[PDB]
Structure 1
Amino acid sequence: GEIQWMRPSKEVGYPIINAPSKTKLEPSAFHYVFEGVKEPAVLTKNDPRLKTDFEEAIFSKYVGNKITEVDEYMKEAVDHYAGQLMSLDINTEQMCLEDAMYGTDGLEALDLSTSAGYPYVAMGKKKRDILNKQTRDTKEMQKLLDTYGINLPLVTYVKDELRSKTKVEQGKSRLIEASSLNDSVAMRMAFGNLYAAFHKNPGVITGSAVGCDPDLFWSKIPVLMEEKLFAFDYTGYDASLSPAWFEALKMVLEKIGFGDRVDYIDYLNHSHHLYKNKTYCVKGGMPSGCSGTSIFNSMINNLIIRTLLLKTYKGIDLDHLKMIAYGDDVIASYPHEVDASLLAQSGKDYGLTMTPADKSATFETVTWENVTFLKRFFRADEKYPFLIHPVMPMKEIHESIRWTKDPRNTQDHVRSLCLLAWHNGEEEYNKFLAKIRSVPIGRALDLPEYSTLYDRWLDSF
Structure 2
Amino acid sequence: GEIQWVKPNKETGRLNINGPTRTKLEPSVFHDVFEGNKEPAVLHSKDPRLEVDFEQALFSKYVGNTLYEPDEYIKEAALHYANQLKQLDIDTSQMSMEEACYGTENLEAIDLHTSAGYPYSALGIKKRDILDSTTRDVSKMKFYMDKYGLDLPYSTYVKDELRSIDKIKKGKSRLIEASSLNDSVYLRMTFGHLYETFHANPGTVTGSAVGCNPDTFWSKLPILLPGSLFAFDYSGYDASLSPVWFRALELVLREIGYSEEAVSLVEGINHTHHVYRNKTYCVLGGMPSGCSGTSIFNSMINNIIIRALLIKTFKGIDLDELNMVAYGDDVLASYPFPIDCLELARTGKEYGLTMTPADKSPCFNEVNWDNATFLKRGFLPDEQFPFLIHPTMPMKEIHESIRWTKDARNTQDHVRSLCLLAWHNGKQEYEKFVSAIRSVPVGKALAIPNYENLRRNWLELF
TM-score where L is the length of structure 1: 0.98
Is 2:119 the counterpart of 1:111?
no
CA drift of 1:147 comes to 1.7
Where does residue 443 of structure 2 map in the other structure?
442
Where does residue 375 of structure 1 map in the other structure?
376
Where does residue 43 of structure 1 map in the other structure?
43
Letter in 2 for 1:438: S
Where does residue 262 of structure 1 map in the other structure?
263
CA drift of 1:428 comes to 1.2
Is 2:132 the counterpart of 1:132?
yes
Is 2:141 the counterpart of 1:141?
yes
Equivalent pair of 2:15/2:119 in contact (CA under 8 Å)? no
Equivalent pair of 2:307/2:319 in contact (CA under 8 Å)? yes
Q: Give a deviation string over 1:299-333, Cα, whole Å, max 9, x none.
A: 00000000000101132011110000011000001
Q: In structure 2, what is the Cα distance between the partners aligned to 1:98 and 1:441?
A: 45
Q: In structure 2, what is the Cα distance between the partners aligned to 1:206 and 1:121?
A: 35
Which of 123-132 and 59-68 deviates more?
A: 123-132
1:391–1:157 CA distance, 2 compared to 1 (3 A): same
CA drift of 1:297 comes to 0.3
Equivalent pair of 1:226/1:321 in contact (CA under 8 Å)? no
Over aligned residues, Cα RMSD in angstroms?
1.1
Where does residue 180 of structure 2 map in the other structure?
180
Q: In structure 2, what is the Cα distance between the partners aligned to 1:398 and 1:294?
A: 27
Where does residue 316 of structure 1 map in the other structure?
317
Q: In structure 2, what is the Cα distance between the partners aligned to 1:170 and 1:375?
A: 23
CA drift of 1:431 comes to 1.7
Q: In structure 1, what is the Cα distance between the partners aligned to 2:141 and 2:429?
A: 49
Where does residue 287 of structure 2 map in the other structure?
286
Letter in 2 for 1:287: P
Where does residue 346 of structure 2 map in the other structure?
345
Letter in 1 for 2:343: L
Matches within 5 A, 1:413-428: 413-428=414-429
Q: In structure 2, what is the Cα distance between the partners aligned to 1:267 and 1:409?
A: 39
CA drift of 1:115 comes to 2.3
Letter in 2 for 1:304: I
Letter in 2 for 1:274: V
Q: In structure 2, what is the Cα distance between the partners aligned to 1:408 and 1:183?
A: 35
Q: Give a deviation string over 1:367-422, Cα, whole Å, max 9, x none.
A: 01011000100001111111110001001110001111122322222221111111
Which of 406-415 and 232-241 deviates more?
A: 406-415
Q: Return 5+ residue gaps in structure 1 as ranges.
A: none
Q: In structure 1, what is the Cα distance between the partners aligned to 2:425 and 2:353?
A: 34
Letter in 2 for 1:18: N
Matches within 5 A, 1:79-228: 79-228=79-228
Letter in 1 for 2:136: R
Where does residue 66 of structure 2 map in the other structure?
66
Letter in 2 for 1:397: I
Where does residue 362 of structure 2 map in the other structure?
361
Letter in 2 for 1:398: H
CA drift of 1:15 comes to 1.8
Letter in 2 for 1:197: T
Equivalent pair of 1:86/1:256 in contact (CA under 8 Å)? yes
Equivalent pair of 1:226/1:320 in contact (CA under 8 Å)? no
Q: In structure 2, what is the Cα distance between the partners aligned to 1:213 and 1:2?
A: 35
**Sequence identity of aligned pairs in percent?**
67
Q: In structure 1, what is the Cα distance between the partners aligned to 2:413 and 2:110?
A: 21
Q: In structure 1, what is the Cα distance between the partners aligned to 2:188 and 2:407?
A: 30
Q: In structure 2, what is the Cα distance between the partners aligned to 1:81 and 1:112?
A: 35
CA drift of 1:354 comes to 0.6
CA drift of 1:8 comes to 1.1
CA drift of 1:11 comes to 1.7
CA drift of 1:114 comes to 2.9
Where does residue 239 of structure 1 map in the other structure?
239
Q: In structure 2, what is the Cα distance between the partners aligned to 1:38 and 1:55?
A: 21
Equivalent pair of 1:107/1:192 in contact (CA under 8 Å)? yes
Where does residue 229 of structure 1 map in the other structure?
229
Where does residue 333 of structure 2 map in the other structure?
332
Letter in 2 for 1:126: K
Which of 411-420 and 326-335 deviates more?
A: 411-420
Q: Give a deviation string over 1:34-74, Cα, whole Å, max 9, x none.
A: 11110001111111111001111010000000112100000
Q: In structure 2, what is the Cα distance between the partners aligned to 1:198 and 1:166?
A: 36
Q: In structure 2, what is the Cα distance between the partners aligned to 1:56 and 1:362?
A: 29
Equivalent pair of 2:235/2:355 in contact (CA under 8 Å)? yes
Q: In structure 2, what is the Cα distance between the partners aligned to 1:288 and 1:265?
A: 14
Where does residue 394 of structure 1 map in the other structure?
395
Secondary structure in 1 matching 2:266: helix
1:58–1:206 CA distance, 2 compared to 1 (3 A): same
Equivalent pair of 1:10/1:16 in contact (CA under 8 Å)? no
Moved over 3 A (4+): none
Q: In structure 1, what is the Cα distance between the partners aligned to 2:364 and 2:154?
A: 38
Where does residue 2 of structure 1 map in the other structure?
2
Q: In structure 1, what is the Cα distance between the partners aligned to 2:203 and 2:49?
A: 43
Equivalent pair of 1:250/1:259 in contact (CA under 8 Å)? no
Letter in 2 for 1:367: N
Where does residue 52 of structure 2 map in the other structure?
52
Q: In structure 2, what is the Cα distance between the partners aligned to 1:172 and 1:304?
A: 26
CA drift of 1:133 comes to 2.0
Equivalent pair of 1:228/1:336 in contact (CA under 8 Å)? yes
